[PDB]
Symmetry: D2
Subunit: 405 residues, 4 copies
C-alpha cells in the first residue's frame, strides 16, 4: 500500500519507533533536563521495555520500523552517508580543527556503530588521539564545557515528533528546543534514501533540514490527521502559527486537506503537545486532560480563493471536543478524563486498531475506564521509558494507517 496516515484510530499497518540507545547512556543528572528528560534512566531495562513494546505490536501484524536499523541500512549506502555528514559535520557544528578527523573515524566505523553515534552523539574521548580532540577533553574538565562533537539525541525515542505523516504526505519538522533540532536531518535521510521510502509515492508537505526556519516550528505530537480531509494541529508551545500557516497552505494547495482545526493551547513554559492532553482510543472515544482541554480555543482554517494568502481563519464558538465531534460527523465524543486513589494521566495511548490501544501499566484507573468503555488496553512499563515525558503515542510515528468511516 501507498504510504500514508488517514486517521488516529484505524488499523495501523506501518509505524516507526526508536529504541533507547547510546544517547540515553549519555544522560547525566546535570544534563537530563536540558536533554528534555525528568531524570537519568536505566538504559538496559528501557531497551527491554521498548522491545516488549515493539513486540506487542509486531505480533499484531503491524510492521514496526526501528529508527537505528533504518539509519544503519541507510548509511550502508555510500551516497546516503555522504549526504548526512556533508550537512552534519561542519565548521559551525564540530569545529574546523575537528571536522576532518571526526568524519574520518566515523567513515571508518561499521555501519551499525556509525548509526549508533549519529544518534548517541560523539565525545572527544571517542575519537583517536589528536591535539584537537585533547583540548576538548581539557575544556570540559578544566572549565565544564561540552565536549560533544555531535550531541546526544535521546528524544529520537519520540518518533511521534520529528516527522509526521498527513494523509500520504509527511512533514520534516523544525524542532522547537534546539536539543531536538538535529533529529530531522537523520529521519530525513531515511525517507530520502532507504529502500522503504525512496521509490515510494508520497509528498513532502512542509519542512527542510537544510533550510533555517527561525520562528516557524512544528512538532508531530501536535498533528492529527483524523480522517475527513480534516487535520487537527495544536498551537502555541511547540508548534507556531508561522509553521501551521505554511503547512495548512501547502495541504490546501495539493488538496490533501479540506480543513485544519487549530487548537490554541493556553501558554505555559510547561511545553505540552496536543497528544499529551487529548488522545483517541476509538471512533467516538477520547481521553482528555479536562483542566487543559476546556481552555483550548479552536479556530477552523479553510482554503479561500477570495484571500491573497488563499485561506480563511474563523474562530469556533463551541468547544474543542464539540468541534472535533462534528468535524467527524458525531452527535458527541465519549470521554474519559485523566485528572479515585492516586493521580493518573492516561493520555497518549496509541490505537493499533479501532478498539485496541497500547498505554502504560501505571495508569490503572484511566485504563480500567478505557476498558469499561470497550477498549482493549495493552500496557507496557513506563518505569524507564516514561522518564522521557512521553508514552505510546509519543513513541510512534504512523506511516501507514487505514481510514475509518
Amino acid at each position: 500500500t501507498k504510504l500514508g496516515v488517514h486517521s488516529e484510530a484505524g488499523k495501523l499497518r506501518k509505524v516507526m519507533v526508536c529504541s533507547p540507545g547510546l544517547a540515553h547512556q549519555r544522560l547525566t543528572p546535570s544534563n537530563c533536563d536540558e536533554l528534555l528528560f525528568d531524570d537519568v534512566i536505566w538504559v538496559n531495562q528501557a531497551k527491554r521495555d521498548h522491545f516488549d513494546f515493539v513486540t506487542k505490536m509486531r505480533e499484531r501484524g503491524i510492521d514496526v520500523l526501528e529508527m537505528h536499523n533504518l539509519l544503519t541500512e541507510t548509511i550502508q549506502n555510500p551516497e546516503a552517508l555522504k549526504w548526512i555528514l556533508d550537512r552534519k559535520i561542519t565548521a559551525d557544528s564540530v569545529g574546523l580543527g575537528l571536522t576532518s578527523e571526526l568524519r574520518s573515524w566515523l567513515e571508518s566505523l561499521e555501519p551499525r556503530k556509525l548509526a549508533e553515534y549519529l544518534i548517541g552523539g560523539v565525545a572527544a574521548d571517542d575519537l583517536p588521539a589528536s591535539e584537537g580532540a585533547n583540548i576538548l577533553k581539557m575544556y570540559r574538565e578544566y572549565l565544564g564545557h561540552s565536549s560533544f562533537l555531535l550531541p546526544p539525541l535521546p528524544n529520537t525515542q519520540f518518533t511521534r515528533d520529528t516527522t509526521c505523516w498527513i494523509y500520504g504526505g509527511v512533514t520534516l519538522n523544525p524542532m522547537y528546543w534546539p536539543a531536538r533540532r538535529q533529529e530531522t536531518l537523520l529521519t530525513t535521510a531515511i525517507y530520502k534514501f532507504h529502500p522503504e521510502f525512496a521509490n515510494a509515492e508520497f509528498e513532502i508537505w512542509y519542512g527542510d533540514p537544510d533550510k533555517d526556519h527561525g520562528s516557524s516550528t512544528l512538532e508531530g505530537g501536535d498533528v492529527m490527521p483524523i480522517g475527513n480531509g480534516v487535520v487537527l494541529i495544536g498551537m502555541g508551545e511547540r508548534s507556531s502559527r508561522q509553521a501551521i500557516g505554511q503547512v495548512a497552505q501547502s495541504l490546501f494547495a495539493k488538496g490533501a486537506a479540506e480543513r485544519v482545526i487549530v487548537a490554541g493551547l493556553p501558554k505555559s513554559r510547561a511545553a505540552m503537545h496536543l497528544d499529551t492532553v487529548f488522545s483517541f482510543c476509538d471512533r467516538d472515544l477520547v481521553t482528555v486532560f479536562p483542566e487543559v482541554v476546556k481552555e483550548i480555543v479552536p479556530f477552523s482554517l479553510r482554503p479561500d480563493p477570495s484571500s491573497p494568502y488563499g485561506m480563511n481563519i474563523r474562530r469556533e464558538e463551541k468547544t474543542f471536543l464539540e468541534v472535533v465531534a462534528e468535524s467527524l460527523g458525531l452527535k458527541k465524543l465519549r470521554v474519559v478524563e485523566t485528572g479515585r486513589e492516586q493521580w493518573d494521566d492516561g493520555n497518549n495511548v496509541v490505537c493499533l486498531e479501532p478498539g485496541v490501544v497500547v498505554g502504560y501499566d501505571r495508569n490503572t484507573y484511566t485504563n480500567t475506564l478505557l476498558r469499561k468503555a470497550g477498549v482493549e488496553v495493552i500496557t507496557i512499563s513506563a518505569s524507564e521509558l516514561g522518564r522521557g515525558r512521553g508514552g505510546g503515542h509519543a513513541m510512534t510515528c504512523p506511516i501507514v494507517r487505514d481510514p475509518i468511516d
Copy 2:
C-alpha cells in the same frame, strides 16, 4: 585615520551607542528576564542618564554615534530599507498573513519613527485595524501568546556585543541568546549603507545575518584587541570555539593579529561576558572579579603555516593575568579587585576614553576610589536604570576608532 580599534586603553575617537527607547517601554515583570533585564526601568530617566553619558564623552572630543540615529539615516536610502525589510519580514518570522500589512505600514512611517519600531519591536495593536491583527490579538487575549510581529530588542543598548572592531575590521556577531540575534541585521545594515561606513576602509573579518552559523556564537563583550598584534577572546559562555576558530582563522590570513589569547571561562548558564569580570582601566591596570578570573584557563592561538587548519593552540601554564601581562611586554598587570570593603562592589565593565580616563557607575565607590588612588580619573554615570540591564560603560560602547597604545 582609518576605522579600527587598536587597544582597550588608547584614545577613543569614535564610539557607537544606542539609547534606551521603545524596546524598553515594552518591558514588563513577566517578560524582562527573558529579555535579559533585571526588572522594568524608568525609561525617561534612563534616557536622561544615557545622554549624560553621551555628553560626558562628547565634551572630550570623542565622536559619539548613536544607533537610532544611524538606523534612521540608513533608512532614508530606499535601498538600505529594502535590504532590511526584505530580511526582517518573512513568512518565517512574521507569518504568511501579516507580512504585507506590516511592511506596508512600516513604509508609511517617517524614518526616525520606523527606526524606533525596528529596534523597539511591533505589537499587534500597533497596526491599523484588520482581521490579521485581530486573529493575532485573540491568540493573546484568550491564549496568552505573544502579539509581537517584530520583537523588541532592548539590549541594542549594549552596542559592545552586537558587533566589534578588531584592529582594522569588524565582526557581525551571531548572538548567543535568541532574544538578541535579530540585533545583528540592524547594525550590519548601517555598516553597509550609512555614509560613515559605506565608503570607509575596513575589513569584515567574520559574520553575516543572512547565514545560520548554528553552534557558532560570538559576542563583542568577549573580545579585546588589547594591541601589540593580539586579541583576547573569552570562551565557553556567550562565545563558542566554533566561532572563535573562524575569527582567529580570518584575522591571521589577512595579518590583522599575530596571536589570540582564548580566555577559557568557567561555565554558568547564568551567561556572563569576559568584560564583566575582567577590565582594562589603564595600559597596565585592570579590574578583576577574583572568584571567576582565577578560574580562567588561558590558551594561545597562533597561526601555523604548516597545519591543515593553519594554526596551533598551546595551552598557557601561567595565570590569565600573567598571560595578558606578558603579551604586552609587561612585567605584571596592576589590579583592583571587584566584588566585595563597606558593601558589595561590582566595579568591572568601565570604559576607557583615553589612557588614564575611564567612565563607570557612581555606586561602585570602592572600586572607584581605588582606580583613583591608582592614578586614574574616573568619570561616573548613574546605574539606577541603565544598570537594571546588566551592563556598564564598556557594555554600552562599541569603539569604531581607538588609537594604538605603545
Copy 3:
C-alpha cells in the same frame, strides 16, 4: 491623645520607619534573593533617600520614629537588653560554642552600635579573634557555609509588616519567611520597654515572639484598619487563615472591631501592593489582581462555638470596601501610557496628601488629577527591596475620618 490607627487616610501623627543599614551592607548577588531583595543596593545612597522620606514627613508635623533609635534607647535599660539577648542568643541560634563571646562582645559596645548589629546581623569576622570564630570562618572559606552568628534583617526597612496597629492595639506578627521572623522580637522589645510605649495605653490583639505559631503567619502589609469598626486583611499569601481567624476573634472579644473583610488573594505579595488608599474615597489598584480578590465578611455571632460568622461576599472587593465605609463607589486609579508602572503602595500623610516614588510618573499624574498632593522620593535603591512608602511605614497614631 491615645495610641492607635483608625483609618488609612486619616491625619498621620506618629510612625515608625527603619533606614537601610548594616543589614543591607551584607547583601550579595548570592544572598539578596533569599533576603527578599531584587538585588544588592547602594547603601549610603539608600540611606540618603530614606532620610529624604523622613524629613519630607517631619516637615509635615508628623512624629517619625526611627527604629534604630528606639532600639538604641530601649537597650540602654539593662533589663531590656537582657530581655532581648536571652531570647536572641541561644544554642539553637548562635551555637553553644559562641553564645558567651558573642554576648559579652555585644554588651561591650556603645548602645547605638549594638543596635546596628541586632538589626544588621553579625559575622564571624566582626568578632574578636577566637578559635570558635575561626572554625566559623573555616566553614565559610572551605564549604560556603554562612558565617553569620546573627543574621542581617534588611527587611526591618519595611516596618509595615513586622507589626501593625489596629484601632488602639497592636499585633506582634508571626512573619512568613524565615528571613524576617527575627524582626518581631526586636520591635516587641521596643513596644515593651521603650518609654514611648511602656506607659502608653494600648492592647496587644495578637502575637508573641516567644511562641512558635506554626502555620499562623500574619504580615502588616495585609492589614488595614480603614474605619467604621472594620478591618481589611489579605489572605492566602503571607497571612494564613489560622492567623487571621485568631486575630479577628481577639478583636471582637475586646470590642475593637465590628467586621473583618478577609481579602482572598490568588496563587508572594501583600494587600497594600495591589491595593491602597490615596484619599477618603480613592484608591490605587492593580486590576489583574484586585479583580480576582474573593472577599469574605467575618462578623461576631453568639450562634457559633468559635463565636464568628463568615459569609462570602458576592460583589467585588472594591464594592464591599466601598459599602463598608458608606461610600456608594470608590474612585479608582489603575496601575496596569508610556511604560509599565507599579504605583500602588503610596502612604497617605493625611487626606489628600501621599508620598510615593518618583518613577511612577503616570500614576502620580493621574493621582494629581484626582486632587491628591503627591510627594515623591527616590526608588533607585529603596525600591529594590520591593517596597514603597506604605511598606516602609508603620503608623502608630492616625486619626479616623467620618
Copy 4:
C-alpha cells in the same frame, strides 16, 4: 531488650521502615516538587516493592517493624492518641473553625485507618460535610488554596531521617524542610508509648517535637555510629552546626561516644549517606566529586573547654579520617557516578544486612557488579517507583538494633 545501633556494617537485628501510602496518593505533579519527590509514584506498585524489600529482610532473620503498624498499635492506647492529637491539632495548625470537628472525626475512626490519616494527611473533602469544611473547600475552589487540614508526610517512607539511633540511644530529629517536620511527633509517640519501646532501655540524646529548635536541624541520613565510640555526621545541608554541637555534647556528657567526626558538606541545593556508604567492614561506596570535597573536623570532649568540647580541622582526606578512626590502614573504595562504565549510576545508599551483605537497587548494575567483585552479596529491589522519592535502602531503613563488629 537492649536497643542501640553500634555500627553501620554489623548484624542488623531490628529496623523500622515505613511503607508508601495515603501520603503518596496525594502526590500530584504540582505538589511533588515541595513534597521532596521527583514525581508522582505508582502507589500500589510501590507498595508491592516495599513489601519485597521488607520480606527480603525478614527472610533473613531481621526484625522488621512497619511504621503504620506501630502507629496503629500506639493509637489504640487512649493516652498516646491524646498525646498526639493535643499537639497535632491546634488552632495554629488546623484553624479555630475546624479543630473540634477534625478531632471528633478522627477519634471516631478505626485505629489502623486513623494512623493512615495521621501519616497520609487529611483533606477538607475527607471530613463529613460541614459549614467549616465547605469554607475551606471554597478557599480552594475560588482561590486555589491548599485544603489540607493535616499534611501528607510521604517522606515518612524514609525512616532513616526522622529519627536515628546512635549507640544506646536515639535522637528525635528537628527536620530541615518544613515538609518533613511533622514526622517527628509521630515517631516520638511511637517510641514513647508503644510496648516495644516504652519499656525497653535506651537514652534520648537530643530532640523534642515539643520544642522549636530554630536553626538547629538534624537528620538521620547524616548520622553514622560506625563503631569505636566514633560517630560521623555530615554538616551544612540538612544538619546544622548548632544541632550537631548539642548532640556531640549530650553523647560526650553521658559517655556514649569518644569522638564525633563532622563531615563538612560543600554548599547546597543531600545527606551524607547519599554520597558515602559502608558495604563491609572496610568497604565504602563513594561519590568522588562530592566526597573529594568533604572537609572533616574532629570534635572530642574537653574539660578545659567552658562548653566541654574542642573541634579541629583535618588535612587528611575524609576517607583517611574515617579509615584512621576505624583503625584501618585505608578503606577499600568503590566509586559511583571513571572506570569503563556504560551509563550514569548511583549505587550509594545501599544498606547492610550484616558484614558482606547489602540491599541496593537493581538499576545500579555497574556498582553492584564492583561490589560483588569486592566480595559483597548484593540483594536488589526495584527503584522504578520507590526511588522517585530520592532515596535507597539506607534511606528507607532506621536501624534500631545493629550489633557492632
